[PDB]
Design a protein around this ligand. Sequence first.
Ligand code: PTY
Ligand SMILES: *[C@@H]1O[C@H](CO)[C@@H](O[C@@H]2O[C@H](CO)[C@@H](O[C@H]3O[C@H](CO)[C@@H](O)[C@H](O)[C@@H]3O)[C@H](O)[C@H]2NC(C)=O)[C@H](O)[C@H]1NC(C)=O
Ligand SMILES: *[C@@H]1O[C@H](CO)[C@@H](O[C@@H]2O[C@H](CO)[C@@H](O)[C@H](O)[C@H]2NC(C)=O)[C@H](O)[C@H]1NC(C)=O
Ligand code: NAG
Ligand code: NAG
Lengths: 167, 192
Amino acid sequence: QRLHMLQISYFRDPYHVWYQGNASLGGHLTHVLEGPDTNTTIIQLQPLQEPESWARTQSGLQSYLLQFHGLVRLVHQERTLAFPLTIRCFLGCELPPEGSRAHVFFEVAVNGSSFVSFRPERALWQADTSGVVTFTLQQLNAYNRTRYELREFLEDTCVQYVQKHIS
Amino acid sequence: PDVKTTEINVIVSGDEQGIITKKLQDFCMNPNNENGTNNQIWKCYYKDEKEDKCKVKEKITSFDEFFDFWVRKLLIDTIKWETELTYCINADCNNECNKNCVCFDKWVKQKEKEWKNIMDLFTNKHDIPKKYYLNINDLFNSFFFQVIYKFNEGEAKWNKLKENLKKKTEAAIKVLFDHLKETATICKDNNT
Ligand SMILES: CCCCCCCCCCCCCCCCCCCC(=O)O[C@H](COC(=O)CCCCCCCCCCCCCC)COP(=O)(O)OCCN
Ligand SMILES: *[C@@H]1O[C@H](CO)[C@@H](O[C@@H]2O[C@H](CO)[C@@H](O[C@H]3O[C@H](CO)[C@@H](O)[C@H](O)[C@@H]3O)[C@H](O)[C@H]2NC(C)=O)[C@H](O)[C@H]1NC(C)=O
Ligand SMILES: *[C@@H]1O[C@H](CO)[C@@H](O[C@@H]2O[C@H](CO)[C@@H](O)[C@H](O)[C@H]2NC(C)=O)[C@H](O)[C@H]1NC(C)=O
Ligand SMILES: *[C@@H]1O[C@H](CO)[C@@H](O)[C@H](O)[C@H]1NC(C)=O
Ligand SMILES: *[C@@H]1O[C@H](CO)[C@@H](O)[C@H](O)[C@H]1NC(C)=O
């Protein structure tokens, strides 16, 4: 089946953000995320992961939030962004029944309009439609973290989670 | 005493491409100064995280805006200094490497003064917001993209700095200051 994740980031200005998100295992709501940048609460509605494993996952998600905010702050500092703004990240993994490779995605929208998205084949980000876009892509396509580590989260971590918690 | 007030004289390298020693050249010859190409007089006011102000030409920013700039530039300059002093890491004739080292030690001391002046805006150590007193992991996650951008092989230099702070000792900035103070010690001893 599938694990979908949604994150909405409401920026009042470059330095303050309110996060609001959730995750689902095929229709069923499993996780919620909410709070300001400094105190974001992340919860698994059902004890799917044991304490140790959940604490590790939360640590990864909190590191992600700090990095994500950093990237937005960088784009603003370098290219200027118009505030307030909202960013939406929609990502996940889908396992076909008799299908070898899991389908994965990570799509970013800004103020309700498609912006950039991840292409897992070569682990590169592309525009979904320009100084801001060009700069953002340059950054996302520059580092192992935003390319290969991200692909491994989607294709490996996400897929194993679906296989363990649905099956 | 609701609103705490401080003066912070920030030694700005420059948001430019180049050797750290040439922009801070005017600061290396002229250390303590109200003038100098690298002087930046800030006046900050802090009540809540809801209400805070900072001012400098006559720009007025939020404390968060100033602090992001200050931490971001502290981390960029540290890496720029470290790469420059790498060749300065024992016996010579009034060395350029020794002059670079003298300015770095002076610069670390200036940055500590900037940091302590920023800290005066907070009454007690027990209650300084998490937002401004981040740990090693948090600080290195929060400033990943902003610092890394300035450097070719930036991801590696950032990881090197994080491992070195993790080896040292708590707030990442105190650990960073311990690491800088130590770099200056090693540098001065291996140069003189
Ligand atoms: C076990 C399954 C795990 C799931 C846990 C279940 C809980 C679900 C809760 C749902 C809510 C969260 C929604 C956010 C999803 C993001 C997931 C983070 C990805 C992740 O973990 O990857 C880390 C790197 O992230 C990065 O790649 C960092 C780069 C960030 C950039 C992202 C692009 C967006 C920016 C676009 C903004 C543009 C603005 C410009 C105008 C490394 O993972 P690790 O540390 O675990 O790996 C250890 C293995 N060695
Ligand atoms: C995302 O949507 C935002 C919706 O609020 C939008 O912000 C709005 O647009 C501009 C910013 O470019 C603001 O500026 C206008 O108002 C000020 C006074 O507040 C005037 O001085 C200006 O001349 C101008 O007319 C709007 O105020 C602002 N709307 C609100 C409710 O604050 C962002 O621009 C959008 N951002 C992106 C990146 O798409
Ligand atoms: C940065 O990226 C390269 C990949 O482009 C790393 O090399 C390996 O390549 C695979 C992808 O083909 C990565 O997923 C692995 O993590 C890497 N293999 C090993 C054994 O580590 C390269 O090592 C990376 N360099 C740094 C300094 O992070
Ligand atoms: C996930 O969050 C968005 C907004 O934060 C919301 O519209 C959506 O309905 C949520 N999903 C579920 C299953 O409630
Ligand atoms: C963190 O935020 C949530 C709401 O998002 C709030 O209920 C909680 O009390 C906050 N945590 C702290 C430490 O105050």
